[PDB]
Design a protein around this motif. Structure first.
Motif, PDB file in Angstrom:
ATOM      1  N   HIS A 161       0.820  -1.214   0.000  1.00 35.07           N
ATOM      2  CA  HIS A 161       0.000   0.000   0.000  1.00 35.07           C
ATOM      3  C   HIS A 161       0.855   1.265   0.000  1.00 35.07           C
ATOM      4  CE1 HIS A 161       0.935   0.563   4.317  1.00 35.07           C
ATOM      5  NE2 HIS A 161       0.823  -0.749   4.377  1.00 35.07           N
ATOM      6  N   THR A 187      -7.469   4.204  -0.016  1.00 34.24           N
ATOM      7  CA  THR A 187      -6.959   2.892   0.381  1.00 34.24           C
ATOM      8  C   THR A 187      -7.826   2.224   1.446  1.00 34.24           C
ATOM      9  OG1 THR A 187      -4.637   3.505  -0.044  1.00 34.24           O
ATOM     10  CG2 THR A 187      -5.072   1.584   1.397  1.00 34.24           C
ATOM     11  N   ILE A 229      -2.288  -2.013  -3.871  1.00 34.36           N
ATOM     12  CA  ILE A 229      -3.241  -0.913  -3.978  1.00 34.36           C
ATOM     13  C   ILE A 229      -2.441   0.353  -4.286  1.00 34.36           C
ATOM     14  CG2 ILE A 229      -5.143   0.326  -2.872  1.00 34.36           C
ATOM     15  CD1 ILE A 229      -5.321  -2.022  -0.856  1.00 34.36           C
TER      16      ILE A 229
END
Length: 420
Positions: free
Chosen positions: A33, A42, A145
């Motif tokens: 992330h 997120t 992500i």
């Protein structure tokens, strides 16, 4: 590949449910992330991904902060970013260790010829590719992500940028930063393809080859006004997936993230949020205003960020920034003839911030297309020491910047400006 205005948690959930349903085995999962530096959605993606993963028998949910050279995050910051509590067992946060050889896995080298071609022959050597060794552990799936926005070094962010520089290391990252700065922000920013993007893609090929887990890209696109407005989540798989999702992302971002003006600016105040911790990121205030014609010659860029008190969080890189200070490309190339060991990432950063200028190599004198002023808690004397301007942050107020050729930019350093 979901889209909305706004894109909803409900739609996102339907997408993530679908993706998880197509996963066959999940006991061990890794989520890579963005960091505290990225304001995005997120938390809507991560928390729902984890929830659905639990329902299908997830044993271990590991996360990796794609830091690049940025500081480590506190556990609490992972919680905020992911929307997941530290108190879930099965959940394990990890910081990246960019500068720690022991944390990295060697996957292979970029050949000297290609490296030379991306860097106008400036480098001319094999570049080793080393990334966080977590990528190669026994994971059943790895979810990246990432988020796409115009970027001063990679044309756009997102896609494989989360791998490099996100969880990479010095050599390859120095190389792409230097390749990028030779082309330069004015030409590079907001282009889909460019030298850094070529380097990143070439290196990532060797990486995805060695990953045995199934790999997903969850490529976000969003607006930021006063809050984050999610606009798209492009979900795809494997190396080629990263490429597709990134290209779609860039097409949407290029329509959403460019602000147009009709007259060159004499004054621009970039109003910087808490998320930009130091000059390294607050420099986005300068980069977003460097398309040709956006700033008037002699124009002032004022980076207004009262909370900032450092250039980089890494003491060594901070020392390096202060050593060389902020100068134009031709001064820096000269400085590297003198100091051939000097770090090229810092070198690229300094040019990136300072912008266009001339260097007389007989006299050493510099002239600059525009001025860059720090309105932060970095003292005036420490600012001029690094060749930057200063303004008392307490004296900066929006009402002073409403004249025809001034601009109060909120949120600062986010949108790319262009002449209409």
């Amino acid at each position: 590949y979901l889209e909305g205005d706004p894109l909803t948690e409900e739609k996102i959930k339907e997408g993530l449910s679908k993706l998880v349903e197509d996963l066959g085995k999940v006991k061990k999962v890794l989520v890579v992330h963005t960091d505290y530096t990225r304001v995005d959605f997120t938390h809507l993606v991560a928390k729902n991904l984890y929830r659905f993963l639990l329902e299908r028998g997830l044993k271990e949910f590991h996360t990796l902060n794609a830091s690049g050279t940025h500081r480590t995050m506190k556990i609490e910051e992972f919680e905020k970013k992911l929307g997941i509590s530290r108190n879930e067992r099965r959940v394990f946060f990890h910081n990246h260790e960019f500068f720690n050889p022991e944390a990295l896995a060697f996957v292979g080298t970029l050949p000297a010829g290609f490296v030379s071609e991306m860097t106008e022959g400036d480098l001319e050597e094999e570049i080793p590719i080393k990334v966080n060794r977590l990528l190669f552990e026994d994971f059943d799936a790895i979810f990246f992500i990432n988020g796409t926005v115009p970027h001063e070094s990679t044309g756009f962010s997102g896609g494989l940028k989360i791998v490099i520089p996100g969880i990479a290391s010095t050599e390859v990252v120095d190389t792409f930063h230097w390749a990028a700065v030779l082309m330069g922000i004015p030409k590079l920013i907001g282009t889909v393809d460019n030298p850094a993007r070529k380097i990143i893609n070439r290196a990532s090929e060797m990486i995805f080859e060695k990953i045995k887990a199934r790999s997903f890209t969850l490529n976000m696109v969003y607006e930021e006004e006063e809050e984050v407005i999610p606009r798209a989540l492009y979900i795809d798989e494997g190396y080629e997936g990263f490429l597709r999702a990134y290209e779609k992302a860039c097409e949407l971002s290029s329509q959403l993230h460019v602000k147009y003006i009709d007259r060159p600016l004499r004054r621009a105040v970039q109003v910087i949020g808490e998320e930009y911790d130091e000059v390294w990121t607050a420099g986005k205030g300068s980069y977003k205003l460097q398309r040709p014609g956006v700033m008037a010659k002699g124009g002032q860029i004022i980076i207004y960020a009262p909370h900032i008190k450092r250039f980089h969080s890494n003491p060594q890189m901070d020392k390096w920034i202060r050593e060389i200070g902020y100068h134009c490309k031709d001064y820096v190339k000269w400085y590297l003839k003198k100091h051939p060991d000097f770090n090229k990432n810092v070198a690229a950063h300094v040019i990136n911030v300072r912008g266009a200028g001339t260097f007389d190599p007989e006299t050493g004198k510099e002239e600059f297309e525009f001025d860059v002023i720090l309105a932060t808690s970095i003292p005036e004397d420490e600012c001029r020491a690094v060749n930057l301007g200063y303004m008392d942050p307490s004296k900066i107020k929006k009402e002073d910047f409403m004249d025809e050729d001034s601009l109060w930019i909120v949120p600062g350093g986010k949108y790319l400006y262009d002449l209409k």
